[PDB]
Amino acid sequence: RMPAFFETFPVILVDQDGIIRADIPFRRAESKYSIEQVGVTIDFYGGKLNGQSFTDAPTVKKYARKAQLGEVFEFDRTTLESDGVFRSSPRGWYTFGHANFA
């Protein structure tokens, strides 16, 4: 997952030891290991996709980039005409106002 300090993060896949296994690379030429090279399969569990598993290599890269944001969610963004950049909570807006007033 991307930490809170970053803003763009490469979508690297790790095991439970920290070692990489797939990376969806920036440079496709002479990429040693990619999503479709090692062939990762998504097995969804719970939610809207309870039991939907697919090994299509274009559709694995779609839900790989979203799951570095932490959890996948269906967004209704034709209501407020949303622009697609993350705003800040009232926990973080209060602290901008109050540590600058003080």
Binding site: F26, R27, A29, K48, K61, R65, F75, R77, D83, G84
Partner: protein, 254 residues
């Protein structure tokens, strides 16, 4: 301004003057070039210079109106001609004398500007040219003509202003991560400006000799070239462009 008038000039008096891209004239008429069916042959030094770049634009676009090629103005520099497009001529299709492309500066990336302020870029090339002409003699007539495949303007490893590319680059609008965080029907699908397609199209040419010399110095003739323009790796629709300038060549006996 022939070859034998141009080779006597030093580089210190050609450089800067705009004469180094001027497709040299090759004075002569009442001549022919015989091409034997057994002997090997090659065009060399095939300089091709266009003039009067014209992009086909629609004027009515509903009905009862043509697509008149509006005259544009050149926008980059004097970088537009081609130099040294040698290739073997000795192939003979049941008569036709065809020459295929071998090497040289086939392409020249220039932009022109339509009326309205829009700059169209295009890749004026003759890469993979296969031009046939009816007959075995060359001079004062015998119009060549064939199809050339243009490549796309940008290649696959051309990065965008936002770091997307065909061969390289990001595969998402990475400055909008909240649009990527949608799961169903909103996951940057609005953009297929992301999936960059190196697409390859074809263009036609037709060139007349319009002058000859029986020793060397083949044409100093004219040409008419119809061609597509840049598609921005599959982002905008290409326009047709019509180029009509002066080419020149030289046949050596091989």
């Amino acid at each position: 301004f022939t070859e034998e008038d141009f080779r006597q000039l030093s580089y210190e008096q050609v450089k800067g003057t705009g004469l180094a891209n001027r497709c040299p004239e090759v004075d002569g008429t009442k001549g022919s070039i015989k091409i034997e069916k057994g002997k090997k042959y090659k065009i060399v030094d095939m300089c091709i210079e266009p003039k009067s770049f014209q992009v086909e634009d629609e004027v009515g676009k509903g009905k009862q109106a043509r697509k008149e090629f509006v005259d544009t103005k050149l926008m980059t520099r004097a970088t537009y001609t081609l130099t040294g497009i040698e290739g073997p001529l000795t192939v003979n299709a049941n008569g036709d004398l065809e020459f295929q492309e071998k090497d040289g500066i086939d392409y020249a990336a220039t932009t022109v500007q339509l009326p309205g302020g829009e700059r169209v870029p295009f890749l004026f090339t003759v890469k993979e040219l296969v031009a046939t002409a009816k007959g075995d003699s060359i001079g004062s007539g015998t119009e060549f003509g064939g199809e050339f495949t243009v490549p796309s303007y940008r290649t696959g490893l051309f990065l965008d202003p936002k770091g997307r590319g065909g061969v390289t680059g990001y595969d998402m609008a990475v400055a909008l991560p909240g649009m990527m965080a949608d799961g169903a029907e909103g996951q940057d699908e609005l953009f297929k400006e992301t999936n960059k397609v190196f697409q390859v199209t074809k263009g036609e040419i037709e060139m007349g000799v319009q002058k000859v010399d029986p020793s060397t110095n083949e044409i100093a003739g004219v040409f008419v070239s119809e061609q597509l323009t840049d598609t921005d790796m599959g982002a905008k629709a290409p326009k047709n462009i019509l180029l009509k300038g002066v080419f020149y060549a030289r046949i050596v006996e091989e």
